[PDB]
Ligand SMILES: [Ca+2]
C-alpha cells in the first residue's frame with residue numbers, strides 16, 4: 001500500500017491509554033504496511049526513562065499483538081523518549097531535539113502529529129509552546145489530536161478552542177471521540193445515501209421518531225470520583241450521543257468530502273433547540289440507579305467515592321427537536337445510563353405507519369430500521385407482511401444481518417481508525433468546533449437546571465432499562481423505545 | 486369460528502385431483518371448525534358407486550390427514566354420490582335429486598358451489614345444464630369453480646367465457662390458479678401497501694426492473710403427451726406467471742376490496758403491450774432442454790411420448806412492457822422452464838442504484854427486494870452498506886427472513902385457500918376475465934410466431950438456468966437475473 005510518512009509525538013506517552021490503545025494501534029498500521037521506513041514515534045511524559053526503558057514499555061504494550069518478534073523489534077526501532085515538563089517553555093528545546101533527531105534519522109519531511117494524552121489543563125499550554133518553541137514542521141502538515149474531554153461546559157470549551165487557535169487552525173485540530181471511530185457508526189451514511197429507498201425516506205414524511213441508545217450493564221465501579229460531577233449527561237450524552245445524532249440528523253451533503261459532511265451536520269446542529277427550565281422538565285429525564293434484585297447490585301449512593309447525598313445522574317433520557325424542514329415535528333430520543341439491562345449502542349429509526357387500510361383486524365404498523373453498533377454489528381429491518389392466518393391480516397416480521405466472523409476480525413478498532421485518519425488528513429469521523437459548541441450549549445441548559453435542582457431525579461432498579469419516566473416521555477408522543485433489553 | 490353453511494357438488498369426484506387435494510382440503514375446513522353441521526358434499530362422475538363405496542373413496546382420500554377416526558366418520562356423513570353423464574340433460578334430474586336431498590338432510594339454505602374437476606370440453610355443457618335443469622339454488626349464492634385451463638388461446642377462452650355467462654355472472658365464476666393461492670404470493674400486497682418506504686418506491690423512479698421466476702428441476706416426465714402442445718409458454722407463463730405479474734404491476738387500489746384490487750390489476754393488464762413478429766424475437770426467448778452432465782438427464786427429444794422432431798419449448802424467458810406512467814420504461818422479466826438448476830418460484834425487485842458519489846472505488850449498487858414463494862417462504866433485502874476496509878468503500882449486504890416451522894406448518898395449502906375463499910365469496914386471489922383475456926392475447930402473439938417457426942429455438946444443458954439468450958436478453962438493458970441457481 002502507499003507509505004504513510006509521518007512523525008507522531010505522544011504527550012503522556014507512559015499513561016495507561018498509550019499502553020493499552022495508542023501504541024498497539026500504531027503497531028497495526030505498521031503490520032498492515034502503511035508505516036514502513038519514513039516514520040517515527042516520540043514519546044514524552046513527566047517521569048524519566050532512557051531509550052531502552054521506553055522501548056521496553058512499548059514492547060510490553062504491543063506484546064499481545066506481536067506475531068513475529070523480529071517485526072516487533074523492527075517497529076520498536078522507530079521509538080524515542082524524553083522526560084518533559086509541559087509547563088516549562090525551556091524544556092521544549094529538548095523535545096524539539098528528539099523530534100528533529102527522529103526526522104533526520106528516518107528522513108521524514110515534516111508531517112507531524114502531536115497527540116495530547118494528558119490531563120485537559122495542559123491542552124492550551126502544550127499548544128502554545130508547540131508553536132512558540134518551534135516544534136511545528138515548516139514543511140508538510142501539523143495536526144493536533146486532542147484527547148477527551150474538550151471542555152466541561154461551553155465557556156471552558158470555547159476558551160480551549162481560543163487557546164488552540166493561537167497555534168493551529170480548526171482543520172488541524174482532531175478531537176478524539178472513539179464512538180465516531182466505530183465501524184457501524186460509519187455505516188449510517190452508506191445505508192442512507194447509498195440506498196435511494198432510505199435516502200428519499202430520511203425525513204418527516206416517512207419517519208415518526210429516531211432513537212439513539214447507549215446502555216451499559218456496569219455501574220460506576222471505580223471512576224466515581226470524576227463521574228460524580230460528570231454523570232451520564234456529560235460522560236455519554238454531550239459527547240458520544242450528540243455526535244451520533246449528528247450523522248443521523250444531517251442534511252444531504254453536496255458531496256462526500258469532510259467539508260460538505262460537516263456543513264450538512266452543522267445545518268442540523270444549528271437548528272437544534274436549546275431548552276429553558278420548563279422545557280428541560282418536559283423533554284428530559286435524569287435518574288440514579290438503586291439496588292437491583294441481587295445485593296451485589298448496590299445503589300449508586302453506596303458506591304466507593306460517592307457522596308451519600310449525591311444527586312448525580314447515572315441515566316439520562318430526553319427528546320431533541322430540530323427546526324429544519326426535513327425534521328419538522330420528528331422527535332429524536334436519546335438515552336444513556338449505567339446498570340441497565342444490556343450493554344448496547346444502537347440506532348432505531350421508527351417509520352410512520354402506512355394509511356392504506358386492508359380491512360384487517362391488525363392494520364399496518366410502524367416499520368423499523370435498527371442499526372446495532374455495539375457489541376456486535378447488526379442491522380435489522382422490521383416490515384409489515386401477511387400473517388399466516390386464514391383471514392387476511394398483517395403482522396410485522398424481522399429481516400436481519402450481522403457482521404461475519406471474517407468481518408468482525410478485520411474491523412479496525414476506533415483508536416487505529418482515528419490515528420490513521422489524522423495521518424491522512426481526514427476529518428470525516430471527527431467532531432468540529434461548531435458541533436462541539438452546540439452540543440455544549442444544548443447540555444449546559446440541562447445542567448443548569450440540575451445544579452439548581454429544579455428538576456426531579458428519578459430512581460430505577462439496576463438491571464432495568466431506566467425509570468418509568470423514560471417510557472412516559474415517549475408515550476406522550478405515542479412512541480415507545482424499540483429496544484426493551 | 487363462524488359456521489360456513491354451503492353445499493358443494495364435485496364434478497369428476499372420483500378423479501385423482503379430488504382424491505389428492507379436493508377432499509383433504511375440505512376436511513381441513515371441517516377440522517378447523519368452519520364446516521360444522523349445515524354443509525354437504527355431493528360427488529358425481531361417470532363410474533357407478535353406491536354411497537358406501539364413495540364414502541370409502543373419501544375415507545382413503547383423507548386417511549393421511551385423519552387424527553381421530555370418529556371425526557373423520559362425522560365428516561364422511563356429509564358425502565353422497567350419483568353416477569352421471571354431463572352431456573345427458575335428463576340425467577341432471579338425478580343430480581338435482583341428490584343436491585336437494587342433501588339440502589334438506591343438513592338444512593342448507595342454498596349457498597351452492599359447483600366444482601368442475603373435469604376435462605375442459607365439459608365446462609360449457611355443465612354450466613348450461615346447471616341452469617336449464619334447475620340445479621341452481623333459488624336462495625343464497627351459486628358459485629362455479631372452473632378448473633384449469635380456461636381456454637387454450639384467446640378465442641377458445643372467450644368462447645368458454647360466453648358459454649359460462651349464459652348461466653352465471655362473471656363474479657360467480659372462480660377460475661382455479663393454485664399459484665394465486667400460495668401464501669407468499671398474497672404477501673406481495675402487504676409488503677408493498679403496508680410499508681410506505683416500499684409503497685412510495687413501487688414505480689419507475691426507484692425500480693430498475695422486476696423479475697419473476699418459476700423454475701423446476703424436473704423434466705417433462707410423463708405429461709409429454711399434453712405438454713408437447715402446451716409447452717412452458719402455456720403451461721406456466723400464460724397462467725401462473727401472468728397472474729403473479731398482475732399483483733406486482735397493479736396500480737395502488739382505492740381500497741382492499743377484490744373489486745378495487747381487480748380494477749387496479751386491470752389498469753396494468755390493459756396497458757400491457759402485445760408483440761408482433763419482430764418484437765417476439767427481440768423481447769422473447771424459447772428453448773428446449775438437452776442432456777445434462779449425467780446420462781439420466783436425457784434431452785427433451787428422447788423423453789417418452791415426445792416427437793423426435795418436436796420444437797416445443799420447455800423454457801420461456803421474455804420481457805414485458807407496461808404503458809403506464811408508473812412503469813414507463815421498467816422491464817418486467819419473466820422466465821419459466823424445466824430441467825433448470827433449482828425448483829423455485831420467486832420475485833426479484835431490482836432498484837435503481839443511487840447517484841450519490843462517496844468517492845469510493847466501489848460506488849452504490851442496485852438494492853434488491855427478493856420474495857421467495859417456493860419451496861419455503863423467505864424475504865431478502867440486499868442493501869448498500871460500508872465494507873470492512875480501511876478506506877471508505879461500499880458493498881452490498883443481505884438482510885433476510887424465512888417462515889418459521891410454526892408458520893410453515895400452519896400455512897393453508899392453495900386448494901384449501903381457493904375453496905375456502907369461494908365459500909366466503911372472495912375473489913381477491915382469483916383471475917378475472919379481463920386478466921385472462923389479456924394474458925391470452927399476450928401469449929397468442931408469441932405462440933403465433935412459434936407455430937410459424939419464425940423465431941429460434943435455443944438449447945440448454947439440463948441443470949443450468951436456461952439458454953445464454955436468456956442472459957443476453959437482460960444484458961441489453963444492463964440487467965442480469967438476480968437468482969443464479
Ligand atoms: Ca410532544
Ligand SMILES: [Ca+2]
Nearest residue numbers: 804816961962
Ligand atoms: Ca430494451
